[PDB]
């Protein structure tokens, strides 16, 4: 409910703008960020077939986008990212996955663990 609401609002401001995408050379920083976010949240909504996700797994990946960590990452690269990032959090941070569920929402603690897992993981990716 939490991350969803942001994504929903942010994709809608995107949809307000997504026409100035391929014909926008002289856009203001604000509408340039609506597109960027828009294009990336869009990539996070893509999904492979025959592989449904646990709800906490979804929120962890939506989290990447809604918190802006992918804003500087190439659109074409996002699906590759998600696959590696999710494998990592299911492999090493099962505990953290255990806590996004239990808590109902994302605690300050879960907001801490993610803030660091992503930042470092991402740096490793683009390295």
């Amino acid at each position: 409910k939490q991350v969803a609401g942001t994504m929903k609002l942010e994709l809608a401001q995107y949809r307000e703008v997504a026409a100035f995408a391929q014909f926008g050379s002289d856009l203001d920083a604000a509408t340039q960020q609506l597109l960027s976010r828009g294009v990336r949240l869009t990539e996070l909504l893509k999904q492979g077939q025959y592989s449904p996700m646990a709800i906490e797994e979804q929120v962890a990946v939506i989290y990447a986008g809604v918190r802006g960590y992918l804003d500087k990452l190439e659109p074409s690269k996002i699906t590759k990212f998600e696959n590696a990032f999710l494998s990592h959090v299911i492999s090493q941070h099962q505990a953290l996955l255990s806590k996004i569920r239990t808590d109902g929402k994302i605690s300050e603690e879960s907001d801490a663990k993610l803030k660091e897992i992503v930042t470092n993981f991402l740096a490793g990716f683009e390295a």
């Binding site: 391929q22 014909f23 050379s25 077939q49």
Partner: protein
């Protein structure tokens, strides 16, 4: 139409041909954004075949939604990465065309059969950008990617 519409579901693969596409001289006039196969899946044809194909449709669909738009709003306003996907899709469309053995009486061209791997490789290469310097009409009504390159020289004089 009730008849053709009711038939799709009895099928494992659908090749849909279009008059709009035939009208341009693209034969076989197969519509690449409306032809499907049950086995078009990486677990089956492999990740290489699947990715290429999906790419071809991507650039083609992207192009299709730019068409009506730049037709009136002018070519020059486009981003240099956008107007490359314009040049590449237009080549891939042509590279989809192919002289048929049974249509020699219609084409003037010799019939050509392209092995699977060569088709995957040819298109992979166009998406890559390996032929952005080659003219559009070089990819038109040929078999494998070689003949587009050869056809490019014959058009150079």
């Amino acid at each position: 139409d009730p008849a053709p519409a009711t038939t799709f579901a009895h099928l494992d693969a659908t090749t849909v041909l279009s008059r709009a596409i035939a009208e341009l001289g693209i034969y076989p006039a197969v519509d690449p954004l409306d032809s499907t196969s049950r086995i078009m899946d990486p677990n089956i044809v492999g990740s290489e075949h699947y990715d290429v194909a999906r790419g071809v449709q991507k650039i083609l669909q992207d192009y299709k939604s730019l068409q009506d738009i730049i037709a009136i709003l002018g070519m020059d306003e486009l981003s240099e990465e956008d107007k490359l996907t314009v040049s590449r899709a237009r080549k891939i469309q042509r590279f989809l065309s192919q002289p048929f053995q049974v249509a020699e009486v219609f084409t003037g061209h010799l019939g050509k059969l392209v092995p699977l791997k060569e088709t995957i490789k040819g298109f992979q290469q166009i998406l890559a950008g390996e032929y952005d310097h080659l003219p559009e009409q070089a990819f038109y009504m040929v078999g494998p990617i070689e003949e587009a390159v050869a056809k490019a020289d014959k058009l150079a004089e």
